[PDB]
Amino acid sequence: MSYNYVVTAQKPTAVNGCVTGHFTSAEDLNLLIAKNTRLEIYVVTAEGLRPVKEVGMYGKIAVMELFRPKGESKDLLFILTAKYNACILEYKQSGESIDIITRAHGNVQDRIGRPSETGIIGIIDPECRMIGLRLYDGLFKVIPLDRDNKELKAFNIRLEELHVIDVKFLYGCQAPTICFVYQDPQGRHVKTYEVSLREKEFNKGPWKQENVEAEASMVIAVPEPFGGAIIIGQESITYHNGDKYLAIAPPIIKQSTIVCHNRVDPNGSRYLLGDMEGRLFMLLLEKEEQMDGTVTLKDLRVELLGETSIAECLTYLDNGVVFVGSRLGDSQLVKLNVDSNEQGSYVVAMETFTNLGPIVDMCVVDLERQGQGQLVTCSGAFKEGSLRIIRNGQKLHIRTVPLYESPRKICYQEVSQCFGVLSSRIEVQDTSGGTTALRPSASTQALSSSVSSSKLFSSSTAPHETSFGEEVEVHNLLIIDQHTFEVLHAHQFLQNEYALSLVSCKLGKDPNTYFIVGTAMVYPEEAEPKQGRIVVFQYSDGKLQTVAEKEVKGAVYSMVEFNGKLLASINSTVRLYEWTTEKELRTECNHYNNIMALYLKTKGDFILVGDLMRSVLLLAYKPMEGNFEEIARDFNPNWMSAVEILDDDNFLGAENAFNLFVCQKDSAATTDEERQHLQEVGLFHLGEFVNVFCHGSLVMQNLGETSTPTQGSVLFGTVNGMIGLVTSLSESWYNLLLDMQNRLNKVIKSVGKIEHSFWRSFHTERKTEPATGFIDGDLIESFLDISRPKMQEVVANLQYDDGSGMKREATADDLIKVVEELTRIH
């Protein structure tokens, strides 16, 4: 068995949802911002936000909504986790003591159901009579909001429309009414049904219309002054209420997909809209009152306000202050002005809140020689693309290097005092036949530049057509200096060439230090790339020199230096190249028993391979023979996102389901099969998507003394910006901490009353297993924050073995020392 420890160094930074309401007091206006597993509560002031409380939940926050049922003084909070843990929460404050009340809770998962393509959707009735959940295709689940339903019991209504894009509860109806866009073979349509709690079924809806845009994406429930709904698409915005139908198709929105919406004026006169290129629009509803005394919607208008960060959620707050919650770039607070500035913009930034965003890749390098370590991460996407240098100093110090294009891979070349970054920028087919970039970016503003002139694919003979307006990715290699993060050089790869892998190393008997990039020729027609290159560059005297190129028959997904040889994975094949005295790559060995060799790591002569669906494999180079050998393979099927080697026998993997596992070579040579069988000795639900595993630590360790119980250091980056750490334990230390977790779980009150053991259970749509071999360090480090009565309740009858004494009672003050030593690892 194996024993490991996992802790968070920086918590999830990406904004996954934001609502405003009166949650902490019936009086204050609050902003609730949700990050993965983390809920942040703010109070809106005239200058910005006053933080008041932050809680963690044992679950990914999927739905977050504020409602105020008749009889309550203030808003209540509904949250549904991605594992279908539901709860209703209340804020309660006793002087200085702030706590979160779990008013109702339960798990709403169905034994049978197909998870929907557009994900979990949760909505609440305007009269707060019920909560609507869209969890599975063909079913609508109703939790009625009666006082007695403290367990959140619910029932399912059969839904004929299997493919639902989005749904909302409409305003102004005699009964609770849903408005949903659905897609069937005839296209997408907009329909309404009514919901009967008494009959527990759907009844005919107020109005039925069809033929909405093929890419109709979002539904807006317009408030009572107007009534009805607005449907946002790619080209058109339409309003449907009964017989009334209005449609606006302004050319400005066709350019970029609109992803978020929020209501500005409670009457519904004005809405905010945001799009993927970072533009912020105002949707204006023009009122026409008739002499009857009734008000009808006259027309729809869209006005461009300015630019924000690429926003996942928007919230209007008060005054002209809007909160730009971002998942791909920095979250923001921006002020909307009535008068435009001299550039024509009505939007002026106020505050910028750091988001490590998507961490595509990262490397650990000690730039200042502080014997500590810095983390230079490839963070952000599109115009939010950035490089974040992170150092530990009590908080982490983050410097941001804007790139304005997507970063993909980063490697450090000390010989050159610079970094190599693979990038992607979006250009659009323009009227010249070529393409035009939407904005300047790192690749366009490099001091010196070069473009591949390779003739390997120049033979073409493969016709590919272009339509004006289509997007194409242009991949570049960027040379960026470590002292000034000025982009010194930009190398642009071939048309339709994707840069997938980058390494900096010396090879063979060659004293020069090279940048090596592995690419793939990507054509929309191909399911799997069938052409590619390994390119050897030299950065010398402010110029990048192409040294050698090797053609391959696939995509070079991963490369790694291997004892002076170049180890590369081309689709199914794992190949080892030698670097000749003629400065050309020559193949030595191959392994073909793979589906897609996505990830590669090495140690000595051992290679760990990560596959798209066949978990992990341990390969060995037999130098005596000049070939590869299959030492051991994990036969359980897993979809890998990243892998890492912990030691000669333990291997760490990350699943696309937000899970972590560790495999161990059986090392029991009774039978050949036992050796070849990698045993999944560790299972752990992380809750994050891990893109990169990197050996290193940000702790100040110039001299070695007082090393902690933990041994080894692996850092990992995730999509939600979380940076984490995995380390190993001795058998005894693990059991002590594990025995303590089970004690802390009985003592600590969870938000939503979610069982900690459930949360960390390994989970896919097809399996659920109890966690094993992993200490949830974030639970252990919460021992320091629990009250003294709770600490002493935890330490009762606690005996550590393998020590000077076979059983030794632990005191609370003894443990406070142990936990504090553990807190220094990050």
Add this chain to the structure above:
Amino acid sequence: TKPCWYWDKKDLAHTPSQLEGLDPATEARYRREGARFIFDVGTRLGLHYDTLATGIIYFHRFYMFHSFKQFPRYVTGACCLFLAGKVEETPKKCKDIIKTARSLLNDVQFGQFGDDPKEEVMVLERILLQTIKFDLQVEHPYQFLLKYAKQLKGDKNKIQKLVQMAWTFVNDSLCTTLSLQWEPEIIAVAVMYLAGRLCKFEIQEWTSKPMYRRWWEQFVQDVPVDVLEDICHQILDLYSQGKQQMPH
């Protein structure tokens, strides 16, 4: 695709056993003894009649590729029955087959099993499987005797006498190389023919074609009487050579 498991009588002059100086009578004697050894051993162990036959067919086929002077027959027989048991889903442990063999064999005969009987048998399984070319499925005259008898309609007692007499002829034909000369379907017809001739029955009357005097042609196409008469002649030879007579 599938191997050919049938030889011509003339070919039996050239088995390995013949060419190592064994005379025809002796190899025939060895075949009867080996087959009857298989039959007796399995009968004591309670084995289904198909399982006995399969082992006997394995046995007969084996000694078309090897010599009796290099492979002791009772070891071969025991190995065949052991494999037959696994093939036909009537399995037996090797130690039990050995125990029964000791009961039925004298000490000199059991000398063939050497110092470790179980080992000599289990070792041979590798050769047996390669020898029979891993073609394990075997059909036997019994199933056709019943399939064909079922289509006969008439006196219940005359037809049951025909079946049992023919069934005895099938059991007796396992001691011969007929299993190696003619497909089982022909054997089943041949034994029906011999039982009919000896019982002074006219089988055509029981068929759906009572005026089709070559009654068998509606069960087995393309069989000349020459083949049926040769098979019958060989079956009755065993009775005339021994002291036993036709069952009747």
Add this chain to the structure above:
Amino acid sequence: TESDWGKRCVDKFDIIGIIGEGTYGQVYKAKDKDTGELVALKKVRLDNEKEGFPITAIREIKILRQLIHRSVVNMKEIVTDKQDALDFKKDKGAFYLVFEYMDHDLMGLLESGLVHFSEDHIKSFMKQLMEGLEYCHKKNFLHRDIKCSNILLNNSGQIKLADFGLARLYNSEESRPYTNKVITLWYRPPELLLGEERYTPAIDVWSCGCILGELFTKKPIFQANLELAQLELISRLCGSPCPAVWPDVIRLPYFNTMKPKKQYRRRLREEFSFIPSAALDLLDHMLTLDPSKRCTAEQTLQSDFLKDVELSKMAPPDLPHWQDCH
């Protein structure tokens, strides 16, 4: 000739890697040097000599040389390790059973979450499987281990059945005593949970129905670790074994012993309301409690769902390729 099995050496194959291990044993992916064809080799070890050649392999050799169908996996030949010369007693080399290489297995495709099935892909899938099961059932052979790991799929969309290690002959007229537990707990029929032991070919139909449902949810229908909890799950959906719906349930050994929490009513149509009408009928008939009321393999082929499925238009599943890598 092509028929002289057991003599050709495994030298004739370049072993690419190990594709599989477990109860079936060690299976290696290889390419024949002479033909260049990708194969799959199952290592059968007779070295233990407890019972000599394994019976699992004897059945798989015995049955798969008799069964020839598009949807039944083909054993091409049997090859051996370099054997010791003139020393058959010393020799312990193992035999390798040569099969055709199937690109994927259904479990691997589903567990990795990499596949999506439309109704038409499920039609093409089930039609082949039930046609294959029909061929075998009409030959009076019971598979007895129908699970997602034993269904193999090529990228072409062709489906073939595989692990015949537990398959045995069925007498349509006479009851024979069989092994009480044969199928995996998730796919085990209710009769075998109650220990029929004289099971009909309907045990395999129940298993395929569990897959039919699983293809519409991407999650197995009945997942349990213990035989009682499985019967509970089946009962919550199909209804509890009643003498009213299952006349001979009283004869089953554990009927009184193994009782579900309640006498549940059938909810299959309600809980699977998101399934197409033609398929929902197929599920209800395949997941029938009474083995005698459970439909046959042929009857599924003469159903509204699979009858008019043209097998020429294969329609392959949504394979992930580069899109899922990115």
